[PDB]
């Protein structure tokens, strides 16, 4: 458990379950290891969940995710923000997209982890709007698209 303030802090877990908490300004929070809770709040925060299967709150503001190869499987809640990004550790050749329910659900090919953007469909509020991979950038619009076509006829490489 770390709280930081209204200023820009940066906050750093350990290896085990860890709460931290960025308060208002510009934050980075960094989960490290094990299942961690991670609360952006208000400011334009930087979330990592790192290892382990972590909860990501960015918050209002315009908030960037971080997630790669062997980050486990992550969820994001957001609640507000026009430019909320997703940063993957990865081309765009390796990167799958899905629906669940309300969900939207990205996996990383033949490995374990997933990233999970939590009530994607039920609302503007819940959605992140650009998904960088390695070095390209899909768009909202692109994502729900990729997750058609993806669903229809894989053909995109099984
Ligand atoms: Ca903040
Ligand atoms: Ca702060
Ligand atoms: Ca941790
Ligand atoms: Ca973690
Ligand atoms: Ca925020
Ligand atoms: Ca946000
Ligand atoms: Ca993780
Ligand atoms: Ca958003």
């Given at each position: 458990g770390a709280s930081g303030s209204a200023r820009n802090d940066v906050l750093i877990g350990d290896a085990g379950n860890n709460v931290l908490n960025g308060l208002a300004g510009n934050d980075v929070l960094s989960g490290g290891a094990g299942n961690d809770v991670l609360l952006g709040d208000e400011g334009n925060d930087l979330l990592s969940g790192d290892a382990g299967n972590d909860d990501l709150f960015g918050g209002q503001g315009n908030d960037t995710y971080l997630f790669g190869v062997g980050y486990g499987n992550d969820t994001i809640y957001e609640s507000g923000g026009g430019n909320d990004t997703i940063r993957i550790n990865?081309?765009?050749?390796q990167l799958w997209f899905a629906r669940q329910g309300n969900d939207l659900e990205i996996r990383i090919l033949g490995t374990d982890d997933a990233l999970t953007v939590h009530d994607w469909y039920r609302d503007a509020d819940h959605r992140v709007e650009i998904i960088h991979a390695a070095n390209q950038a899909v768009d909202q619009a692109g994502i729900e698209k990729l997750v058609e076509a993806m669903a229809q006829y894989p053909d995109e490489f099984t």
């Open positions: 990865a081309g765009a050749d």
